[PDB]
Design a protein around this ligand. Structure first.
Ligand SMILES: O=C(O)c1c[nH]c2ccccc12
Ligand SMILES: [Mg+2]
Ligand SMILES: [Mg+2]
Length: 709
C-alpha cells in the first residue's frame, strides 16, 4: 500500500523518498538513525500528545456543564476554573535565557510576513520582501487616492507618480530629518569627508542626526544611492536621473527602498490546505528549497553591498530571516500511520521534518548560508492550550534535536497566544519555554474562535464584528505585552501582534495598524510584501524600544478582565441585523470552504457582504462557524435560517468565482464543499475547541477521492 515500514511506523512512500533523496543529503545525519529516531519519538510522545488533547475535551465538558447549571458570578467562575486546573498558579518573576538568536528577532522591530509555504512564488517573494519599493507600494495601492487625475490605468500616470514621490519625500522628512529644509526640495546628494550632504536650491544641508547616514553606493561625489537607518531599519534612496521616474524628479531620485519584512514565517498551518503525504511533501520541498537557497520559479536575493560613510565596504542581509510554522497538537495525518492504521500526530511530524530541513539554512549553499548565522532554527507553534502543552512542545523539540544531532535549544519557539487557556496562564507558558522562546504573538483570530467555543453554553455571543472591541480581547492584547516585557523580552525576543486581513484597504492599514507598535509590539503580521513595506512606515514613526521601556513593570490586565465572556445582551439585535450576520458569515464560510475543499487553497480573498475583500483562513473560518453554531445553539436563529442562508449565499459565491471552479448550486446535497460548510456550522458545537481541521480535512480528502475516479 505504497508505505514503508520502519519500526512501528508505515511511512507514505512519497514522504520517505523525499526525506531520503532531498532532505537528508547534506545534513550529515545517517538516514537509518533518522528514521529510528522518528519511530522512537513518535512512540514515546504520542501518549502524552493524546493525554493533552483528552484534557482539553474534559475541561471543555466541565465548563459546558457548569454553564448549563448556572449575572454570571465571576468569583465562582474563577474559583471553578482554578478547581479544575484550567487556571493555574502564576509562577514567580523570571527572565528568559534564550540565546544564540539573530538580531532580526532580538533587536529589530519591524513587520513580520506570513505566507503559505505550499505556494513557491509567494514564498520566494516573501523571503525577498526584506527590501521593498516604497514607490510601488504607494502607486499600486489605495494609499494614494485615485482622485481625479491620479487614477491608475494601462500606462504610467504622472499625476499619480508625482503624488507617490511627494508622499515618499514627506516620509523622508519625518524619518530622517535634514538639519534645514525638506527632502522635497533636494536637488542632489553627495558624500563629503564621510558626511551626507543634501543639495537644496539655495544651499546645502546635512542630516539633523548624522548617525542616520549608514552608507551609499557608487561614487561618493555622485552616489547611485544613499543608505539611511532609523529605529534600526534601513531606507535607501535610489538615485538615477536617467530613469523614467528619475528624469522627472527634482533630485533624479528613482525610488525609495524600505527594509520591510525583517522576518518571514513560512506557514504549514492555517493558510495552507495539506491533508495527506503528497500535500505535505510539496510544502516540505518548498521549505527545503528556501533553506538550500535554490528555490526558483525568479530566485532568492543575495546580500546587499554598501560603502560605509568612511569609504570602506560592508554588506546587509538581502533576505527576510525565516521562521517555519508547524501545525499544532490536534491533528493526525496519514502521511504516516502505525501498525494498527492509526494516523500519526502531524505536529510531531512537522518538528522532525521541518527541523531536519532547517539544518540546510545553517550552512553554505553553492553561496553563503541563507538563514541563521547564529545557529538557530525558528519554529512557530500554534494553538497551544496552557503551560503543560508548551512544556510538551519543548520536550518534543529537545527529542528532535537529539535525533538531528543538533545542540540542545537550537530549535527556538515562537509561541502563539491564541487559545484562552494559554492567555490566562501566559507567564507559565513562557516560563515553560524560558530557554527557547523567541516570540509570543496574539493570534487574535484563533483566540476569538476559542473565546466563542469555550463559553458556547453560556449564551448567545455578540456579532463577529463586535468582538474586536470587547473587554476580553483588549485585556488579552495588553496582557500579552505585559507578560512578554516582564519576562525580559526587550532586547531578547519579539512581542508580536496579529494579521491585517483587508488586503485592498492599504490606506486603512497605514492609518490603523500603527496601533500595534504603539502598543509596544516589536513586530506584527502582514499578508503580503506590499503590506510589509507599508507597515514598515509605522516602525519609523514609532520608537518601539522606547515604548517597551516605558511599559516595563506595568500590570494592565486582570484575570477578571481576561475572563469577561462576550455574551450579547438580551434583544441586542433587530431581525435584519440577525439576517445580515447570518448571510455574511455564510458567504464568508462558503467562499473560503469551496476553494479549500475543491482546490486545496488554504487562504483566499473572499469579498464579504459589504464587498470588502477579506483574506480568509482557518482561523477566520473558526470564528464564523463557531458564531453561527452559538446562535443556533441558543435560539437566535433556526435550522431553517442556516439552511436558507447557505442556499442563498452559495450561488453568489459561485458567481464570485466562475477559473477551474465548480458550482455548488443548484444541487447542494451533492456538493462536498457545500456539505462541508453546512457541517462546520451544524456540528460546530461538537468540534474540539471549535477547530475546523477535522471537517476540512475529511471533506478535502473526500473531494480528492471523488476527483480521482
Ligand atoms: O491566521 C493566521 O495565522 C494567518 C496566516 N496568514 C493569514 C492571511 C489572512 C488571514 C489570517 C492568516
Ligand atoms: Mg456536550
Ligand atoms: Mg491562528
Amino acid at each position: 500500500t505504497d508505505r514503508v515500514s520502519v519500526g512501528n511506523l508505515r511511512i507514505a512512500r512519497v514522504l520517505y523518498d523525499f526525506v531520503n533523496n532531498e532532505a537528508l543529503p547534506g545534513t550529515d545525519i545517517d538516514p537509518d538513525s533518522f528514521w529510528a529516531g522518528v519511530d522512537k519519538v513518535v512512540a514515546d510522545l504520542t501518549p502524552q500528545n493524546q493525554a493533552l488533547l483528552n484534557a482539553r475535551d474534559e475541561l471543555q465538558a466541565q465548563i459546558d456543564k457548569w454553564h448549563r447549571r448556572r449575572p454570571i458570578d465571576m468569583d465562582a467562575y474563577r474559583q471553578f476554573l482554578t478547581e479544575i486546573g484550567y487556571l493555574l498558579p502564576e509562577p514567580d518573576d523570571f527572565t528568559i535565557t534564550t540565546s544564540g538568536v539573530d538580531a532580526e528577532i532580538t533587536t529589530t522591530a519591524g513587520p513580520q510576513l506570513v505566507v503559505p509555504v505550499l505556494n513557491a512564488r509567494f514564498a520566494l517573494n516573501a523571503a525577498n520582501a526584506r527590501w521593498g519599493s516604497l514607490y510601488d507600494a504607494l502607486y499600486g495601492t489605495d494609499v494614494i487616492p485615485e482622485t481625479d487625475g491620479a487614477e491608475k490605468g494601462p500606462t504610467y500616470n504622472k499625476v499619480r507618480g508625482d503624488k507617490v514621490i511627494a508622499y515618499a519625500r514627506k516620509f523622508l522628512d519625518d524619518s530622517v530629518p535634514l538639519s534645514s529644509g525638506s527632502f522635497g526640495d533636494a536637488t542632489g546628494f553627495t558624500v563629503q569627508d564621510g558626511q551626507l550632504v543634501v543639495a537644496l536650491p539655495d544651499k546645502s544641508t546635512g542630516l539633523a542626526n548624522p548617525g542616520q547616514f549608514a552608507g551609499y553606493t557608487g561614487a561618493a561625489e555622485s552616489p547611485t544611492s544613499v543608505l539611511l537607518i532609523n529605529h534600526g531599519l534601513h531606507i535607501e534612496i535610489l538615485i538615477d536621473p536617467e530613469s523614467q521616474v528619475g528624469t522627472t524628479d527634482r533630485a533624479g531620485v528613482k525610488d525609495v527602498i524600505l527594509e520591510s519584512a525583517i522576518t518571514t514565517i513560512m506557514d504549514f498551518e492555517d493558510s495552507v490546505a495539506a491533508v495527506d503525504a503528497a500535500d505535505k511533501v510539496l510544502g516540505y520541498r518548498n521549505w527545503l528549497g528556501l533553506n538550500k537557497g535554490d528555490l526558483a520559479a525568479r530566485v532568492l536575493n543575495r546580500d546587499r553591498n554598501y560603502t560605509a560613510p568612511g569609504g570602506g565596504q560592508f554588506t546587509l542581509p538581502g533576505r527576510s530571516l525565516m521562521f517555519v510554522r508547524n501545525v499544532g497538537h490536534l491533528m493526525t495525518n496519514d502521511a504516516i500511520v502505525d501498525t494498527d492504521g492509526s494516523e500519526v500526530f502531524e505536529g510531531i511530524m512537522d518538528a522532525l521534518f521541518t527541523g531536519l530541513i532547517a539544518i540546510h539554512g545553517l550552512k553554505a549553499s553553492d553561496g553563503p548560508l541563507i538563514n541563521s548565522r547564529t545557529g538557530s532554527i525558528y519554529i512557530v507553534k500554534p494553538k497551544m492550550h496552557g503551560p503543560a502543552e508548551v512544556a510538551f512542545t519543548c520536550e518534543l523539540f529537545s527529542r528532535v534535536e537529539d535525533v538531528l544531532g543538533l545542540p540542545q535549544n537550537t530549535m527556538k519557539i515562537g509561541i502563539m497566544d491564541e487559545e484562552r487557556r494559554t492567555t490566562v496562564n501566559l507567564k507559565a507558558c513562557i516560563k515553560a519555554a524560558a530557554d527557547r522562546v523567541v516570540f509570543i504573538n496574539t493570534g487574535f483570530l484563533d483566540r476569538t474562535g476559542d473565546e466563542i467555543h469555550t463559553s458556547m453554553e453560556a449564551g448567545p455571543m455578540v456579532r463577529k464584528g463586535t468582538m474586536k472591541s470587547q473587554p476580553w480581547i483588549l485585556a488579552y492584547e495588553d496582557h500579552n505585552v505585559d507578560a512578554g516585557l516582564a519576562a525580559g523580552f526587550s532586547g531578547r525576543a519579539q512581542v508580536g501582534k496579529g494579521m491585517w486581513t483587508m488586503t485592498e484597504l492599504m490606506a486603512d492599514m497605514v492609518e490603523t495598524k500603527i496601533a500595534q507598535p504603539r502598543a509596544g509590539a516589536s513586530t506584527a503580521w502582514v499578508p503580503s510584501p506590499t503590506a510589509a513595506t507599508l507597515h514598515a512606515l509605522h516602525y519609523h514613526q514609532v520608537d518601539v524600544a522606547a515604548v517597551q521601556q516605558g511599559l516595563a513593570g506595568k500590570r494592565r490586565a486582570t484575570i477578571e478582565q481576561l475572563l469577561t465572556i462576550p455574551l450579547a445582551k438580551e434583544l441586542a439585535w433587530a431581525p435584519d441585523e440577525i439576517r445580515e450576520e447570518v448571510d455574511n458569515n455564510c458567504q464568508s464560510i462558503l467562499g473560503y470552504v469551496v476553494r479549500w475543499v475543491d482546490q486545496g487553497v488554504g487562504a483566499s480573498k473572499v469579498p464579504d457582504i459589504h464587498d470588502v475583500a477579506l483574506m480568509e483562513d482557518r482561523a477566520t473560518l473558526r470564528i464564523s462557524s463557531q458564531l453561527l453554531a452559538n446562535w443556533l445553539r441558543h435560539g437566535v436563529i433556526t435550522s431553517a435560517d442556516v439552511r436558507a442562508s447557505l442556499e442563498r449565499m452559495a450561488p453568489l459565491v459561485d458567481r464570485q468565482n466562475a477559473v477551474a471552479y465548480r458550482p455548488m448550486a443548484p444541487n447542494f446535497d451533492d456538493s462536498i464543499a457545500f456539505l462541508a460548510a453546512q457541517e462546520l456550522i451544524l456540528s460546530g458545537a461538537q468540534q474540539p475547541n471549535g477547530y475546523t481541521e477535522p471537517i476540512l480535512h475529511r471533506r478535502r480528502r473526500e473531494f480528492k477521492a471523488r476527483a480521482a475516479e
